[PDB]
Design a protein around this nucleic acid. Structure first.
Ligand code: ZN
Lengths: 101, 217
RNA sequence: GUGAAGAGACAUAGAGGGUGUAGCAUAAGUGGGAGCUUCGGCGCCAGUGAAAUACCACUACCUUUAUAGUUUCUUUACUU
RNA sequence: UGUCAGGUGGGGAGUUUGGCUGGGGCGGCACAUCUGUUAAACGAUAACGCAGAUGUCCUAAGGGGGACUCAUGGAGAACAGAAAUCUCCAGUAGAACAAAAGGGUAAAAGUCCCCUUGAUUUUGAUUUUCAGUGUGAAUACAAACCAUGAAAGUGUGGCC
RNA sequence: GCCCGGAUAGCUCAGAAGGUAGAGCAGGGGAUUGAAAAUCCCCGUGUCCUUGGUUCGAUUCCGAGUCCGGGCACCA
């Protein structure tokens, strides 16, 4: 699916708190950081004799993954998140259009 | 030390400007520039940003100005030291490649009115390009006598494809303690682009046209 | 534990190293830039091009080494 | 020789190695879903019954307003021919609407042209499977903020 | 999910830093010989995987994006 790039929409803002222009970039997940509570709980447990003291998923059936759009405002540059249905291809901008050959 | 070597910042200037043997001595007004060496010198994959930041104290290597104003600005320009130009006159300049190079290399400063910022960068653009001397934002209701300071105050900050900048910092006409001051401002705008300036109090010389081996940091 | 001699540098160095094309001519780039110099000469000026040259400086890219600094080390000797 | 780290290691140690199913196994999916029928004129309803679909595609094929009529047939126009483009007459849909099948639609929900982001925000109520639990989808408002049109209105994604 | 390598005429394989688009496989004709082969000569064949970009100019270089073929990682 293709999307327009910039688009008007509601932002919470608190200034503001109305319709305004936005940028559009794609959301990517952050690096695991190595000092969260679950990682520390995992590494403490997994050290001694036993080997893999938890489940390892490898029955991955479905192919795709949902596309998410990071919207960034123009004035105060606050940010929002709007999800999108599952699709294989995704061009964020912007090969219009065409129609009327 | 003492906010980037304040002891030998003005004695550096005092020994250069008022000297014929050390500083040659040209008839036009001798302008001064800086140089600094950071540890942040990477060619980069993203390519360089280039943001033309202004300075309140005036940079200004301004010898000649070739404007493009009409109606209001032709009356104002002819009274001042500058000289006016028409829209049809631009077509005569472009008709041969030689006269475009005269306007590119020497005539550095520019003034273009609100209606004449919709025909300019087509013909000059490719031939000019590397110099980067394009017009300044001006309307019909400006003073022109005052507008000479606005072009003079503004300066380019383009960094691409080489590990150096050279921003001007006053001249013979300006005051002693301004030049430098300006030194605080000039380095601060490099810190705006980069992350690590290396390291607030860094390196300098003073290169005023014939700035000799006086060699700084 | 105790002794000897070959190698990668980081200071920190300027001698240079640059020949497609058009351009007097072997243009790595970037700025200031209309005179330095007793005269000499070379630039501004003019001109060829994507880019202008002297006179001053800063940064790269390559060779050089003669610094007693880091150690990847690498080679042998001495008995407890 | 001691402590820690990287490889090798069925030589040895521990444990698992789906389900439905005209016996099991081999096939198949009837194991989450959807259309028509079997289904006996409210709803409900079985079999490895019958004919078939889904793990997507779309900034337009979403939203609003304005123009205009499609299948096919007949009669005519140089090259032009059963089939190119042009014009008139008849034309209840016999066309088209992203795909399976059924329903629905004609000054349109089809075809073409102009402007845009209701595929937006804050939370609850409610139908369907139903233990009247969840999941998915769908419907009707409140307070906002916008789009479009002269307006009435319509719009909280794809005609269902 | 990581950090690497390769793509070129119908087929197959060079290319190589600075300025080109090429040997072969063939395919088409000439020259030679009493002919039939082998050898000298002259042709036709390109989005250089794909896009914007980068560039005085570039398939290269330079940095993006997708298509082909190989490695060290694995708590929903
Ligand atoms: Zn805002």
């Amino acid at each position: 699916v293709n999307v327009p790039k910039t688009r008007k929409t509601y932002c919470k803002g608190k200034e503001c708190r109305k319709h305004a222009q936005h940028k559009v970039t794609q959301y990517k997940a952050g690096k695991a950081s190595l000092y969260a509570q679950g990682k520390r709980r995992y590494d403490r447990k997994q050290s001694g004799f036993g080997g893999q003291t938890k489940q390892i998923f490898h029955k991955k059936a479905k192919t795709t993954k949902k596309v998410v759009l990071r919207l960034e405002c123009m004035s105060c540059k606050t940010k929002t998140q709007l999800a999108l249905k599952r699709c294989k291809h995704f061009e964020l901008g912007g090969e219009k259009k065409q129609k009327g050959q | 030390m003492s906010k980037i070597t304040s002891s030998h910042v003005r004695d550096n200037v005092k020994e250069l400007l008022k000297y014929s043997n050390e500083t040659k001595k040209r008839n036009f007004l001798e302008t001064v520039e800086l140089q600094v060496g950071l540890k942040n010198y990477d060619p980069q994959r993203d390519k360089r940003f280039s943001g033309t930041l202004k300075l309140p104290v005036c940079p200004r290597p301004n010898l000649s100005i070739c404007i493009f104003g009409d109606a209001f600005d032709v009356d104002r320009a002819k009274s001042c030291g500058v000289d006016a130009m028409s829209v049809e006159d631009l077509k005569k300049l472009n008709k041969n490649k030689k006269l475009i190079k005269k306007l590119a290399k020497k005539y550095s400063a520019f003034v273009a009115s609100e209606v004449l910022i919709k025909q300019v960068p087509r013909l000059l653009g490719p031939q000019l390009s590397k110099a980067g001397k394009f017009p300044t934002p001006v309307s019909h209701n400006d003073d022109l006598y005052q507008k000479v300071n606005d072009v003079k105050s503004t300066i380019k900050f383009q960094l691409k494809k080489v590990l150096c900048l050279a921003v001007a910092v006053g001249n013979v006409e300006m005051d002693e303690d301004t030049l430098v001051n300006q030194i605080l401002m000039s380095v601060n705008f490099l810190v705006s682009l980069l992350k690590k300036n290396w390291q607030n109090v860094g390196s300098l010389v003073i290169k005023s046209t014939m700035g000799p081996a006086y060699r700084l940091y």
